[PDB]
Amino acid sequence: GQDISLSCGASEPAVDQDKKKWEPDTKFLKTPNTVHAPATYQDPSLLSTVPYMTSRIFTAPATYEIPVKGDKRHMLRLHFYPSTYTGLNILDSYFSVAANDLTLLSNFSAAITCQALTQAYLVREYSLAPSEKDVLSIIFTPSDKHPKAFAFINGIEVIPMPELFDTASLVGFSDQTSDTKTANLQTMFRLNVGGQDIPGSQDSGGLTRTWYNDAPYIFSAGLGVTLQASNNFRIDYQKMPVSTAPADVYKTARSQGPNGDINMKSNLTWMFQVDTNFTYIMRLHFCEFQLAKINQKVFNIFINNRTAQGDTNPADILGWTGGKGIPTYKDYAIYVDGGEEISLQMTPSTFGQPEYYDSQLNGLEIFKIDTMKNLAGPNPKPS
Template sequence: MGRIFAVILWLSVLVNVIVAQKYTPKDNILLNCGASDPQSTDTDGRKWNSDVGSKFLKSSKGSSTAKAATQSPEVGEVPYLSARIFESNFTYSIAVAPGRKFVRLHFYPSSYSNLNSSNAIFSVTAGSFTLLSNFSATQTTEALNYEYLIKEYSVVVVGDSLSLTFSPSSNYTDSFAFVNGIEVLSMPDLYDNADGPTLVGGGLSFPIDNSTALEGLYRLNVGGNFIPPTQDTGLYRSWSDDTPYIFGAAGGTTSVIDPELNVTYKSLPEYTAPVDVYSTARFMTMDNKVNVNFNLSWVFAVDTGFTYLVRLHFCEIFANISKPNQVVFNIYLNNQTAFNAYDIIPLKMAMGFLMFRILW
């Protein structure tokens, strides 16, 4: 089955002390694969259970456990210094409630049991969905200059269990599969938007239903700092600083919300995004003559041949911007017009102080 990738951008706001209501997941499973200790705590204070002897393993046959031969200073011990190794197809069967789940796979390409991490080329499926195909954590981290990887997906579980199958590639000699950590987390329907997002350039809607799986690629806190999973709204998402993705020297200006304003979620669930995401924004100047000479742009590396979901979040953060036609702008995605003359104020009046639109 084809994959649909989610590229997520957020335009922000805040400062008054407001706490968004957190989402409480039915399922919140953290597996520290191959760990010798029954339970370990990561640097964020989250508790991970070892998969050794776990009810999610019907049998350990066909797999082994190992410690990483080396540890980079940038890599936390949990869940990255132990791994489960697969030299043949292996399936985790994870009992969960039906519904949409975040599935996060953690990889640290080190040497395990004298196995060369370059030979770790494998595929991963979740039920009928292919999450990874002929994947190499080593090549990917080297290309991105990362020490470790977190691959995040959103999939729907129809029955009462999620099957995760790791399959070494048959195309390469001595290939094997491995994983350091597995997260399975119930999630609300973040992508519901009537008939679905609109296809940019086509005008057609594309409903996101139970047959749709997504991979999260980028989640940015625009104009703000990195937000770790524990400061999210119960969904344990990470929000990155958007600065590395700004195109060219024209990065605009960042600011925080005026002190007399509050974030009001009204028509949106408070778990949509943490208040800190809406505490900052990146904006152009108030001088139209200056603005016509540049665009405020972000650039993302993506694979060709896929459809990408882009979510833009808006919230007006200036007390003196309260009327229609004060701030109006165009939105382009991949050089195609997504919105002409976009004005947040009329939409804010109709939907509450905070709103978002989904573009396809």
């Protein structure tokens, strides 16, 4: 399962700043006579000019056909650098993107989205379920509600991946689960909690995911205390696929800290802006690398003010895991419908008389589940 990493509009292969090789999109583009254009401004915040400084421009629909193994899951990454191309006004760009019959983006403004997020460029990442097709069709359609609309695209990646999704616990419900193995997903957030950014070249599974530090998403007054294991500390994955997350995610964590009393007076809280009217999977990654005994660190987990792990079954990482240095994760599903936020909160539990009063999280991923063959949300509005 080799990657296909296309720099759209490029004239030759090139390597980016993180050792990833990109090839031009031309051989996979089925639509003739489309415009390729360089960006005429290079933002200093770009980590590389590859693939961002070259684009395709579409004023009518255009289709890519990329060979895939139809029994395999694939990550799809769309790369957008809103800039000036062949004299066009980037604010006029509104378009949809489909993967086969799945709508990914609709009425999408890369420029307004970048403005709202204070970003120079955007990556939109999806995990596409096995399709039973030998070809992935990626279709770009300029908005027919905007007379001046065009579509653009700077990079497209198709990355074969393992079946990393299985089951999620339904947050509103006592003991109910749902199946996610055949879901189509949008990656909303991917955090190395308590740890450094991890570039794609250091990701596990050859999946070149980027894992971001979590501090910008903390919204409680206290930031807790970060925990770090030695770089030589061994994560013993056992049955968990190493492609789930790289070891440096499990070797770092955010906890509440050494004063159990202050910990019980607070929730460690993260907050995320998402799109309303979707079910989301919250994948919480855990690894205890300090304590060695069950019922030492025992905590409640709340998602959108509902108990995800609590009451008489609070979280105990070593209770789940059986050992120091063994990683795990738990998926929780929440339907969101002011309907545009997910909150994650942790605080110690008093159930069972734990030796300490603390909580901990090592990593976090948030995924949107497709509804009605659509993943598209509105553009964020800048403030």
